[PDB]
C-alpha cells in the first residue's frame, strides 16, 4: 500500500466513465491514453458499449479477465462509492478519482467514506477532484489535459486542478522536459510525501516541482524527513500558495481551515533543503536551470558580457540572492586579452565590449569553461548590428561541446525577434536561456541556492 511502482508503471488500467460521447472527461482520458502510446492493457468501462476506440469494453472492472492495477474513475460523485466497491472486489491497487464534488465543496463525510472503503480493500486513492496523472517513461497519459509533453526528468505535482492543468501545457511553451505530471487535488489519501518517496527512487526523475497550498495536520514532520533526504540528490522547488499572511488567511477562509503558519512553513522548507518560488516564472526558470545543469562545485562564477549595463543588472541581481563575484583567474584574463580591446574590463563581469563580433562569444565561452579555476558561467548578450543572435547562440553551443565538461551555464539575451528565436534555439538544446540578464542571473542563482540548501541539510544530518 506504500509502494507506487504499479501506479506509475501499471500492466493494466481501467477507465471508468468513458463513452461514445467524445466530450465526456472519461472519453478524453481514454483518448489521451491511446494517443500518448500506452503499451499495457487498457479496459474501457461502460454499461452499454461493446466497444470504445476499438477496445473491448466491460460493464464492470470486476468483469475484466485480468488484474487491473489502476482504475481511473470519472463517474458522478453519487456513483463513485459503488465503483470503489467493485474495484475492491476486483483487487484494484489504485483508485484515481477524477470526479469533483467532495470535501472541496463541503461534502467532507463522503470524502472520508471514499478513503475508508478504499482502505478496507487495500486500495489507495489519488485525489479526488483531480485531472489525472502522466508518466512519460511508461508512455502513460491518464489525464484530460494536453495530449503530449516534452520528455525529460522533471516531475510536476499540483494541488490545484485548473492551474495544474494549465501549467502542464505551459511546460511545452517553456521547453521543460517532463518525466511526470501528478494532479493530487484534495489529497484525501496519497499526498506529496508519498509521491516524493516514489520520485526519490525513480532514475527517470532528477527534479521535482510542486504547487502546494498546504499539507495535512500531523503530516509535516514526515514531510521534512522525506524531503530533506530527497534534497540530498534531487532539487525540490515549491510554488507555495498562501505564502503571505493575507493569502494564507484567504486560503483558510475558503476551506474553513486554520491558517497555516507562514513563518513555520518557511522554516520547514529550509530544513528540507527546498527552494520556495514566489511565482510561476521563477519556478519554471529555476527548474530549467536545475534540470539541465549540475551543481557548481565552487564559488568561481564568471559573468561574460558585451555590455556594461547588462553586467550591472546581473551583478545587482546576484547580490539580491547573496551571490558575489570575484576576480577572474589571470590565465582566463590573458587568454581573452588575445582578441579583446584595451578598454575591456576584467573585474568580473568580464566585459568584451559592445564591438564584440559573434566569434568572440565562442572564444570567450570556451576559454572560461575550459579554465580549471572557473566553476560556472553566465553569458549575457545585447543585440548589436555588429553581431547576429543566432551566430552568438551557435558559438555558445560550440564552446560548450568543445569544453567537454558540464559546468553550469545560463544565458541572457536582449533584443528583437531575432533574439527571441535564438533564445528558443538554445532552450531547445537544453541550454538555459532567457530574454533578460536578470532572469539568466536568477536562474544561475537557483543552482547556487540548491547547493547551499543541500549543504544545510547535510550539516543538519552531521553525526555527533
Amino acid at each position: 500500500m506504500n509502494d507506487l511502482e504499479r501506479l506509475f508503471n501499471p500492466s493494466a488500467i481501467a477507465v471508468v466513465g468513458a463513452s461514445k460521447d467524445p466530450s465526456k472527461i472519461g472519453s478524453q482520458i481514454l483518448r489521451n491514453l491511446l494517443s500518448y502510446g500506452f503499451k499495457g492493457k487498457v479496459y474501457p468501462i461502460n454499461p452499454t458499449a461493446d466497444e470504445l476506440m476499438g477496445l473491448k469494453c466491460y460493464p464492470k472492472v470486476s468483469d475484466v479477465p485480468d488484474k487491473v492495477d489502476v482504475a481511473v474513475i470519472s463517474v458522478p460523485s453519487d456513483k463513485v462509492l459503488g465503483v470503489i466497491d467493485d474495484c475492491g472486489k476486483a483487487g484494484v491497487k489504485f483508485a484515481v478519482v477524477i470526479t469533483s464534488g467532495f470535501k472541496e465543496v463541503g461534502n467532507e463525510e463522503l470524502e472520508e467514506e471514499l478513503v475508508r472503503r478504499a482502505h478496507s480493500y487495500g486500495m489507495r486513492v489519488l485525489g479526488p477532484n483531480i485531472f489525472g496523472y502522466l508518466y512519460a517513461p511508461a508512455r502513460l497519459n491518464a489525464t484530460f489535459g494536453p495530449k503530449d509533453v516534452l520528455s525529460g526528468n522533471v516531475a510536476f505535482i499540483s494541488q490545484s486542478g485548473a492551474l495544474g492543468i494549465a501549467l502542464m501545457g505551459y511546460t511545452v511553451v517553456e521547453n521543460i522536459g517532463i518525466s511526470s505530471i501528478v494532479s493530487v487535488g484534495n489529497k484525501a489519501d496519497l499526498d506529496d510525501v508519498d509521491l516524493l518517496d516514489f520520485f526519490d527512487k525513480d532514475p527517470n526523475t532528477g527534479v521535482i516541482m510542486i504547487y502546494l497550498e498546504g499539507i495535512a495536520p500531523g503530516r509535516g514532520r514526515m514531510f521534512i524527513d522525506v524531503a530533506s533526504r530527497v534534497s540530498l540528490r534531487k532539487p525540490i522547488i515549491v510554488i507555495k500558495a498562501g505564502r503571505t499572511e493575507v493569502g494564507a488567511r484567504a486560503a483558510a477562509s475558503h476551506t474553513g481551515s486554520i491558517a497555516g503558519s507562514v513563518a513555520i512553513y518557511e522554516s520547514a522548507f529550509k530544513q528540507s533543503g527546498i527552494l520556495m518560488a514566489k511565482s510561476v516564472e521563477d519556478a519554471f526558470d529555476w527548474t530549467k536551470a536545475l534540470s539541465w545543469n549540475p551543481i557548481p562545485e565552487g564559488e568561481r562564477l564568471i559573468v561574460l558580457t558585451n555590455g556594461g549595463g547588462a553586467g550591472v543588472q546581473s551583478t545587482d541581481t546576484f547580490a539580491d540572492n547573496g551571490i558575489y563575484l570575484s576576480k577572474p583567474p589571470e590565465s582566463l584574463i590573458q587568454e581573452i586579452k588575445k582578441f579583446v580591446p584595451p578598454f575591456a574590463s576584467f573585474a568580473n563581469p568580464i566585459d568584451i565590449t559592445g564591438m564584440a563580433p559573434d566569434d568572440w562569444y565562442y572564444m570567450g565561452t570556451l576559454a572560461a569553461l575550459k579554465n580549471p579555476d572557473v566553476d560556472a558561467l553566465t553569458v549575457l548578450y545585447c543585440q548589436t548590428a555588429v553581431t547576429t543572435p543566432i551566430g552568438v547562440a551557435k558559438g555558445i553551443v560550440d564552446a560548450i561541446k568543445e569544453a567537454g565538461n558540464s559546468k553550469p551555464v545560463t544565458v541572457g539575451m536582449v533584443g528583437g525577434p531575432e533574439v527571441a528565436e535564438a533564445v528558443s534555439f538554445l532552450n531547445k538544446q537544453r541550454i538555459a536561456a532567457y530574454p533578460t540578464p536578470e532572469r539568466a542571473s536568477s536562474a544561475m542563482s537557483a543552482l547556487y541556492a540548491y547547493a547551499r540548501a543541500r549543504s544545510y541539510v547535510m550539516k543538519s544530518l552531521a553525526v555527533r
Binding site: 509535516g220 514531510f223 552531521a462
Partner: protein, 229 residues
Amino acid sequence: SSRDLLLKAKENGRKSLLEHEAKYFISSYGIPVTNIRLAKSEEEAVNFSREIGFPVVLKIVSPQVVHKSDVGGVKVNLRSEEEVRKAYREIIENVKRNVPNAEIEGILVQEFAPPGVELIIGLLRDPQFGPTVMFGLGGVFVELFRDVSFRVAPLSEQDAESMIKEVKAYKLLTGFRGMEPVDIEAIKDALIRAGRIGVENEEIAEMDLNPVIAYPKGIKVVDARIILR
C-alpha cells in the same frame, strides 16, 4: 523522575506548572536556571537566602496568581536578612489583600540575576509540523517588533546556530556599545534541549522561557512557563 512534576499537576487538574516546578523541570534537561528554594516560613526563607547567597528575589507561589508582579508578589534585589524578612511579610500581605482566596504553596527564594542581554526561547505545537522552537531577543524585539525565528524539532546544531543568526536583532549578541559578546554556544545548546523537551513530553503544549539572560559565559533562565494539555 522530573515527569512526576507533570503527572502531579495533571492529577490536580492544573493546566500549568508553578514557577519552581517549571524551573526544576527544564533544569533536569540541562537548561541553566536561577538557583531556587521553596520557602514555607519567613525563617526558612532567610536560611535559604543565605545558602543561595545575596542578593535574592522573593516571589509568591500560588496556583491562583499567574501574574505575580501585577499584584505585588515579586520583590527583587534583597541584600540582607532584614530586607528578606521585610519583603516576605509585605508579599504575604500584598497578595492576601488583592487575592484573598489564594492557595499559598510558599514563597520562592531565588538568586538575583545581574543584567545581561535578554532572550526568549519558546516552544509551541504547529498543526502541521508539531513541536517547534522559537528564538528572539528579549524586550521590545519580540514583544513589539515580532523579530523571531523558528525551527521544527528536533533541532540539529545547524538548525540552532542558523536560527540565531537569522533574527534581525542578532548583532545584540556579538558585542555592541557597552556590552561584550555573549555565549552563543550556550544559547544553541539551550535551543536544542528546548526542542528535545517538546519532542519527548507530549503533555507539554507550550513552553516560554522568558526572560533568559545571556552572559559572556553561560545563560540563565529567569522565568519559565509550561502549559499542559
